[PDB]
């Protein structure tokens, strides 16, 4: 149906595997999968934050940016260790002695209604599996609840598929 080129990347989010998906420190009321789609209940953290969020892709994409935020009452995750080509997940401990592939401190304006976190593709040109530890929040809260997360990009080599209409639009 014809054809275009511009700047429209995907969250990857029906390429993401929840079935092989993995949390840590999830709970019980609240799960840590209904924070990656924007219409579902917030992922509160029952001890800190030091949640850990594993994500497992069952096609190698490229992670140029990520979506990292959280609800409406002031609550977000700031500094956030990124992890991949793991040898299968990421715990507390080896999410402190071994270093992340990027890790920045997401702001208030990339923890916004339209936060973006701009991360280094040249790093995860080809990932199947990513992992993310929340360290610290915005403003250094008790705990960080997570409502909305994925990862916008595209995967590095697919068919010629197409998706993606309408949408809003400011002055």
Do not use: W
């Not at 208030?108 to 199947?128: A, M, T």
């Amino acid at each position: 149906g014809s054809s275009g080129s511009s700047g429209g990347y995907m969250d990857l989010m029906p390429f993401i595997n929840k079935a092989g998906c993995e949390c840590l420190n999830e709970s019980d009321e609240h799960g840590f999968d209904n924070c990656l789609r924007k219409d579902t209940t917030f992922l509160e953290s029952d001890c800190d934050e030091q949640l850990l969020i594993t994500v497992a892709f069952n096609q190698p994409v490229k992670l140029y940016s990520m979506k990292f935020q959280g609800p409406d009452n002031g609550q977000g995750p700031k500094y956030v260790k990124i992890f991949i080509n793991l040898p299968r997940s990421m715990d507390f401990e080896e999410a402190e002695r071994s270093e992340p592939t990027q890790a920045l401190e997401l702001t208030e304006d990339d923890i916004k209604e339209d936060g973006i976190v701009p991360l280094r593709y040249v790093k995860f040109q080809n990932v199947n599996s990513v992992t993310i530890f929340v360290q610290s929040n915005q403003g250094e809260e008790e705990t960080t609840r997570i409502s909305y997360f994925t990862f916008i990009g595209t995967p590095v080599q697919a068919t010629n598929m197409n998706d993606f209409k309408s949408g809003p639009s400011s002055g």
